Amino acid sequence: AAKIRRDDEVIVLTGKDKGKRGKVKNVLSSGKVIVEGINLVKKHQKPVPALNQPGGIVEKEAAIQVSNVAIFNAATGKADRVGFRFEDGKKVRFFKSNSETIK
Template sequence: MNKIRKGDEVIVLTGRDKGKRGAVSLRVDEDHLVVDGVNVVKKHVRPNPLKGTTGGIVDKTMPIHQSNVAIFNPATGKADRVGIKLLADGKKVRVFKSSGDEIKA
């Protein structure tokens, strides 16, 4: 079970974008994820008349390692760790470590 999933609100802990918040828009692989507005780079693209794209410099959001982000807890307004709790019916749910509240997905 992934502790950080698509759609979660996260906050960046380290790096150039430290302190920025954004929603996870894509999980690239087991360790990397794309967060909206975080790790944005300028990419030079060539024009492709077959696809109808123009060339130039575009902003592209690159993946970031999941160890560099933490889930954002709206109750406290700070970053928090994620734990897994087993319910009585055998279902696993994600909870905030600080308060034990269930994470709404």
């Protein structure tokens, strides 16, 4: 019963990247997702001789609260909320708006 999953395309409700869109890369146990291209930070990576890392200002993706994102309904062209229902003895997610199953 987790509304947002690894490979869902989502849209951001809040923050500096609000309105933007992206595929979820992975979701954390802490209640945070990392989405592709959305929340970017320019970490100063410390060089290390071992592991073949040179060291520089790497721009990587920082996590974002799940609440802050929303699963995008391609049909409506908008963010929607997710509900759960049993179809053929199997739980499936659906868009509250327009009531269509997520596939």
